[PDB]
Amino acid sequence: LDRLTNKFQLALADAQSLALGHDNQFIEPLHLMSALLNQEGGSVSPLLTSAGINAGQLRTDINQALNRLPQVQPSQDLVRVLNLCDKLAQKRGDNFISSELFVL
Amino acid sequence: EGLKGRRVLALDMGALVAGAKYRGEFEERLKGVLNDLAKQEGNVILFIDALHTM
Amino acid sequence: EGLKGRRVLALDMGALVAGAKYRGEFEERLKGVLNDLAKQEGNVILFIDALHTM
């Protein structure tokens, strides 16, 4: 949706490619987190680092979780999480929905 | 002489395609049996019936 | 005298398959080979054992 920032949309497109590349049936929040942590210039890794969270170890654990997904297109889980991003953006008065909100 | 002491383990299709679902799990069972033949140190004639299948 | 002093490094695709589990890490390590043979800038003559792989 046009509600997302360009960077967020770009990660979502990447999330779809990750899902496809893994032969997964749906795009899960895991695919999107992986894409966001893998985006150069993205705010998610630094956000996490600023809070003391090891972004690199997180990337590894997310990829491991992705590797566990069944192999055989947003899942409802993802729709649900994105809906929350929308509400968090509204509360904050953000013009568009940014990547950082997905973490929360 | 030269062939004494050796086994013949048939490389068998159907049992290698067993309960190893995703990608790499097939490579896990085949990598396990081929590292096993790599560490038997000269004990198995590998056998490929219907050579065009594998 | 033309081909002396040259430090000739050979690619091993059979080594390049190592360390690829999730779908897309062989070409990770292959374009990393494009990274370091990109910075090497002429020092390395390549030999491709079985050119028609490339």
From Swiss-Prot, chain A:
Q: Which compartment or compartments is the protein found in?
A: Cytoplasm
Result of altering L84Q:
Loss of chaperone activity. Retains ATPase activity
N6-acetyllysine-modified residues are: K87
Q: Where is this region: Repeat 1?
A: 4-69
- Highest taxon, organism lineage: Bacteria
Miscellaneous field:
One peptide binds per ClpB hexamer; the binding site is formed only upon ATP-driven oligomerization.
The entry's free-text remark on domains says:
The Clp repeat (R) domain probably functions as a substrate-discriminating domain, recruiting aggregated proteins to the ClpB hexamer and/or stabilizing bound proteins. The NBD2 domain is responsible for oligomerization, whereas the NBD1 domain stabilizes the hexamer probably in an ATP-dependent manner. The movement of the coiled-coil domain is essential for ClpB ability to rescue proteins from an aggregated state, probably by pulling apart large aggregated proteins, which are bound between the coiled-coils motifs of adjacent ClpB subunits in the functional hexamer.
Protein's name according to its UniProt entry? Chaperone protein ClpB
What organism, scientifically named, is this protein from?
Escherichia coli (strain K12)
**Range covered out of full length:** 3 to 113 of 857
Curated annotation (Swiss-Prot), chains B, C:
Q: Which cysteines are joined by disulfide bonds?
A: none
| Record annotation: effect of changing E25A | Decrease in ability to disaggregate proteins due to decreased substrate-binding activity. Retains hexameric quaternary structure and ATPase activity
Highest rank taxon of the organism: Bacteria
Question: What triggers its expression?
Answer: By heat shock and other environmental stresses.
Its localization reads:
Cytoplasm
Its quaternary organisation is: Homohexamer. The oligomerization is ATP-dependent.
UniProt lists the family membership as follows: Belongs to the ClpA/ClpB family.
Other comments on record: One peptide binds per ClpB hexamer; the binding site is formed only upon ATP-driven oligomerization.
What's noted about domains in the record?
The Clp repeat (R) domain probably functions as a substrate-discriminating domain, recruiting aggregated proteins to the ClpB hexamer and/or stabilizing bound proteins. The NBD2 domain is responsible for oligomerization, whereas the NBD1 domain stabilizes the hexamer probably in an ATP-dependent manner. The movement of the coiled-coil domain is essential for ClpB ability to rescue proteins from an aggregated state, probably by pulling apart large aggregated proteins, which are bound between the coiled-coils motifs of adjacent ClpB subunits in the functional hexamer.
Q: What does this protein do?
A: Part of a stress-induced multi-chaperone system, it is involved in the recovery of the cell from heat-induced damage, in cooperation with DnaK, DnaJ and GrpE. Acts before DnaK, in the processing of protein aggregates. Protein binding stimulates the ATPase activity; ATP hydrolysis unfolds the denatured protein aggregates, which probably helps expose new hydrophobic binding sites on the surface of ClpB-bound aggregates, contributing to the solubilization and refolding of denatured protein aggregates by DnaK.
Identify this protein by name: Chaperone protein ClpB
Please name the source species.
Escherichia coli (strain K12)
Q: What is the lineage of its organism?
A: Bacteria, Pseudomonadati, Pseudomonadota, Gammaproteobacteria, Enterobacterales
Covered range within the whole protein? 230 to 283 of 857
